[PDB]
């Protein structure tokens, strides 16, 4: 099942052809302006692969930018029409989650997952039937956002997260005790805007401090509020398999603190090792074999979740 995947949700424009969900026959990437780039990429694709061979066309229908998404979505439906093959509109967040089961072949369906990135911070349950709902959600800023903006405040380079990671290694966490904004609540939600400003106030007040000490204490604040809410939910839902997806999942402090908690309480924790063009095709293929195709009347929604 040769599935053609189009990606115009991310900054890179991408077109991928995948056989049976596991074989890259062709993967083209721009390396932004989707409408200018995509036609070039489709050219290059159709020069190498014969059009007749494509079985299903797939593209992201959200979340993302209304304008960025339409180019891929619109193109895919046209391809679908011209090829006379079915079309699959993929949910980007859903696709990310499914890649956990892709990385780990031997993984039980009932799972809890933390998505912590810039502009994405949520807790979601994966059912046995592989359906999923968002249970926890940030009300203010994302965790990644907090990393980036606090790094700025601290006078540290981009990117916020890895820089704060590295400098915090030389610092003492719990030297200073910043607030954990939503911790000890009857909700699984998150807040980070409060934390961010608290750092700023300390930077305005205090004078003698080490940057290493502030960073590590801010990090440990975040990593506390992530770990608690993640394990609390896993507990109240009786799941002991828990997965960490997203950019800030990279954080060595979080990784350590999760591992510690997952040795005491006997839990399996899964982390990532992303490719964009393929991930669309792979999700497409997966839906194609369940015979679940998208209508041609499908609009893009930029705030797609769950």
């Amino acid at each position: 099942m040769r599935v053609l995947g189009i990606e115009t949700s991310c900054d890179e424009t991408a077109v991928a052809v995948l056989d049976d969900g596991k074989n890259v026959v062709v993967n083209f990437t721009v390396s932004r302006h989707h409408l200018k780039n995509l036609p070039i990429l489709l050219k290059k694709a159709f020069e190498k692969v014969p059009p007749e061979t494509v079985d299903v066309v797939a593209a992201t229908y959200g979340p993302g930018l209304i304008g960025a998404l339409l180019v891929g979505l619109s193109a895919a439906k046209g391809l679908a029409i011209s090829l006379e093959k079915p079309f699959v509109g993929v949910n980007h967040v859903e696709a990310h989650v499914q890649a956990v089961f892709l990385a780990n072949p031997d993984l039980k369906p009932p799972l809890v997952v933390l998505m912590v990135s810039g502009g994405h911070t949520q807790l979601m349950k994966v059912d046995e039937d592989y359906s999923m709902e968002v249970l926890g959600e940030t009300l203010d800023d994302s965790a990644g956002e907090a990393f980036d903006k606090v790094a700025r405040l601290l006078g540290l380079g981009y990117p916020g997260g890895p820089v704060i990671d590295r400098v915090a290694k030389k610092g003492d966490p719990e030297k200073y005790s910043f607030p954990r904004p939503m911790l000890d609540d009857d909700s699984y939600n998150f807040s980070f805007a409060g934390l961010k400003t608290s750092v700023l106030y300390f930077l305005q007040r205090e004078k003698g401090y080490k940057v290493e000490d502030v960073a590590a204490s801010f990090q440990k604040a975040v990593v506390d509020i992530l770990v608690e809410k993640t394990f609390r939910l896993a507990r109240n839902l009786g799941i002991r398999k828990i997965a960490f997806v997203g950019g800030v999942a990279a954080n060595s402090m979080l990784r350590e603190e999760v591992r510690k908690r997952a040795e005491r309480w006997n839990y399996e924790v899964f982390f990532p090792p992303t490719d964009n063009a393929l991930m669309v095709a792979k999700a497409g293929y997966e839906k194609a074999k369940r015979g679940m195709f998208s209508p041609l009347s499908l609009n893009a929604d930029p705030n797609l979740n769950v």
Binding site: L35, S74, L79
Partner: protein, 205 residues
């Protein structure tokens, strides 16, 4: 011959010629372009029993208009013709608006932009379409100056009319005169670029 032409610069406008048969479709409704354009193109092609690979050229409106509309438009065409590299006939939306009017003479076409600004061209339609003033962004005042200067017979403003039959004729014309391009060559008319640059100069003055 077989021609499909479409413009989504405002409303959805589709012309389809199969040999001796011409069919026109327009859509005005609350549904978004992305919800309706592919659905119709699919249905019309099914009903006429026409594979896309059977088409001889596909016209596409590119000219000044709504960004979302033009994007759904162009991208749809990009998808349809990419597997078969079908010659693409780029269609200036305004020019199609002017040509869509029956009467001849001096014609002004205008479309509101950001408040206090307008997309504007003026043409002489007498024999053929002769461009008097090329499409560009103008201030509310500068439009009135242009109206007065050119003393136009026909004014087309805000609610434009595009005849799908005209879209086809032009595609055929463009095909004849060896003026079609590849799907990877299309360059839209983004007049929304100029408007930001003019605001700066006149905001300072």
């Amino acid at each position: 011959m077989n021609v499909l032409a479409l413009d989504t610069s405002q409303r959805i406008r589709i012309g389809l010629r199969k040999g001796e048969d011409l069919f026109e479709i327009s859509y005005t409704g609350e549904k978004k372009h992305a919800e309706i354009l592919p659905v119709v193109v699919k249905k019309l092609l099914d009903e006429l029993d026409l594979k896309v690979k059977d088409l001889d050229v596909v016209g596409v409106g590119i000219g000044p208009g709504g960004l979302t509309g033009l994007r759904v438009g162009i991208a749809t065409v990009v998808g349809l013709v990419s597997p078969y590299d079908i010659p693409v006939a780029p269609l200036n939306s305004f020019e199609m608006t002017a040509k869509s009017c029956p009467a001849d003479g001096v014609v002004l076409v205008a479309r509101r932009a950001r408040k206090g600004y307008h997309y504007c061209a003026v043409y002489l339609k007498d024999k053929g379409l002769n461009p008097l003033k090329e499409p560009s962004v103008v201030s509310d005042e500068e439009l009135e100056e242009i109206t007065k200067e050119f003393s136009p017979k026909i004014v087309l403003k805000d609610d434009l009319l595009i005849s799908p039959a005209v879209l086809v004729e032009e595609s055929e014309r463009l095909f004849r005169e060896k003026k079609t391009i590849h799907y990877y060559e299309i360059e839209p008319l983004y007049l929304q670029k100029s408007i930001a640059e003019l605001n700066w100069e006149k905001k300072k003055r």
